[PDB]
């Protein structure tokens, strides 16, 4: 007969509907006897302030997100509270046999985005008939308030069980694109039927067209996914992406491909996907060595396309079928797409990695740490002659890397070039999804600044034209991709 409760921690943003601050679980349905549930509960002035509505909604599920992610695949009903009360009774009728309520919000149009613009509550009763039941609290609510959230892709959304994988890009015009790998009938990577699906925003990634697949899987082995994003210089949207067999499972005979496929309306179609695997690996590359390299993927997210108008990505490529290494190189051309070169080497027992352009010209890469090398730092390296060769640069190293994927963002910050990490942050786990700054003159990364709190993985980031950050992260444990608009003075200090 205790009560279990939950307080939220996911972020919000101004004017959004029934965000979940605490919900509750009943062991069981109230016993028929029943007539009537009481709540009684704490909300701060600086809450209350933020709010503009609350409500007990009713569900006959618990589930991890605010009920409206799920876009009606969870039931619910509501029962608005005046924003000053701090009790609220339903009948047993109203519940209908149902176990699960959350005190729930609805968000004003507020204009401040601090660290301390955090929403919260706490249930402090519950009673049946008069009679207190006990309670256990398991987390406190927490809600960042940010200037953009969104879920933009949540299992059960469009019959598909699961998404991974986010690819944000802006292009030129100011259109947002977000991507990710429908991973339609369980979690897991190729070679698993797995679709391409975007969104789009025309507004700053204030609202989202609906997703749309847009390199559909045919089947087991014949998915696709790991989709990484560029615009070229002559204003082509590129992606890159892979299909088929699993990295594993690849061979020079039987290859994973790389394709490419090109937009010249902000993203809205996309040519038919070109095989380039040939430029890279395996029976039918050129070069007789890499012809008989196993496996190539390019890391999911962005590439980067420099001044010049060199086109790259870095491919992390199974060089043995001896061993279960990958060696990094980046993957480039000089011809709007037409044919793609490697680069030397630059780092051996790599994994994902990323690129950024230095104020100087040099170019930085963002090395995944795999198998937890050394002190399970981040790896970084330099280029001096646009991402031909590398050097490793320890100057660079400084922040945890408990093995994910993420991004970098070159930006300006108070008259001073750094460098906008996102990692999660959690000692040696997927959670904490958090950024950093890497001051480049005074060679130090700032304290991790949490974003988002929890379960976190894979993180892509775009800079929007204000110098604002659009943030793309996997959050929970069953995976939502979640787009997410900051501003760094708000963050840091």
Same mark, same amino acid.
């Given at each position: 007969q205790e009560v279990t409760m939950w307080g939220d921690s996911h972020g919000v943003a101004p004017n959004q509907m029934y965000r979940t601050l605490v919900k509750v679980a009943l062991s069981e349905s109230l016993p028929p006897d029943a007539k009537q549930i009481r709540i009684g509960f /704490? #909300?701060?002035? =600086?809450? =209350?302030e933020k709010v503009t509505a609350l409500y007990l909604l009713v569900s006959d599920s618990l589930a991890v997100r605010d009920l409206p992610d799920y876009k009606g695949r969870v039931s619910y009903d509501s029962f608005p509270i005046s924003k000053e009360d701090r009790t609220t009774a339903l009948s047993a009728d109203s519940v209908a046999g149902r176990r699960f309520f959350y005190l729930a919000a609805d968000i004003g149009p507020v204009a401040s985005f601090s660290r301390s613009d955090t929403l919260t509550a706490r249930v402090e009763e519950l009673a049946v008939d008069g009679r207190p039941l006990p309670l256990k609290e398991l987390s406190p609510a927490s809600r960042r308030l940010y200037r953009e959230y969104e879920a933009l892709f949540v299992p059960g959304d469009g019959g598909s069980r699961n998404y991974r994988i986010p690819a944000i890009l802006k292009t030129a015009n100011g259109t947002l694109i977000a991507m990710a790998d429908r991973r339609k009938y369980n979690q897991t990577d190729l070679p698993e039927? $797995?679709? $391409?699906v975007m969104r789009r925003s025309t507004d700053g990634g204030k609202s989202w067209s609906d997703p749309r697949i847009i390199v559909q899987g045919e089947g087991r082995n014949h998915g696709f996914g790991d989709v990484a994003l560029v615009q070229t210089q002559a204003?082509? #949207? #590129? !992606? $890159?992406?892979?299909?088929?067999?699993?990295?594993? +499972? /690849?061979?020079?005979?039987?290859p994973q491909r790389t394709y490419i496929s090109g937009s010249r309306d902000e993203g809205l179609t996309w040519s038919p996907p070109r095989d380039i695997?040939?430029? $890279?690996?395996?029976?039918?590359?050129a070069d007789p060595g890499r012809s008989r390299w196993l496996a190539s993927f390019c890391? /999911?997210? +962005?590439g980067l396309v420099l001044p010049s108008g060199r086109i790259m990505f870095v491919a992390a490529i199974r060089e043995s079928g001896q061993e279960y290494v990958l060696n990094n190189y980046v993957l480039y051309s000089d011809d709007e797409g037409d044919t793609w070169q490697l680069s030397d080497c630059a780092y051996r027992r790599g994994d994902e990695a990323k690129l950024s352009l230095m104020p100087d010209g040099r170019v930085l890469m963002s090395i995944r740490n795999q198998g937890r090398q050394e002190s399970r730092q981040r790896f970084f390296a330099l280029s001096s002659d646009d991402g031909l060769t590398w050097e490793r640069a320890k100057q660079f190293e400084g922040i945890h890397d408990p093995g994910c994927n993420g991004a970098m963002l070159q930006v300006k910050r108070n008259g001073r070039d750094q460098v906008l990490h996102s990692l999660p942050l959690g000692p040696d786990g997927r959670r904490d999804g958090a950024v950093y700054l890497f001051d480049h003159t005074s060679g130090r990364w700032s304290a991790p600044v949490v974003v988002n709190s929890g379960s976190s993985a894979y993180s892509? !980031?775009?800079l929007l034209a204000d110098g604002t950050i659009g943030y793309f992260v996997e959050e929970d444990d069953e995976i939502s991709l979640v787009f997410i608009r900051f501003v760094l003075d708000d963050l840091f200090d």
């Open positions: /704490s #909300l701060p002035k =600086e809450t =209350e039927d $797995i679709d $391409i204003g082509k #949207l #590129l !992606m $890159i992406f892979v299909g088929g067999v699993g990295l594993w +499972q /690849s061979t020079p005979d039987r695997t040939h430029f $890279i690996f395996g029976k039918d590359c890391a /999911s997210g +962005q892509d !980031m775009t």
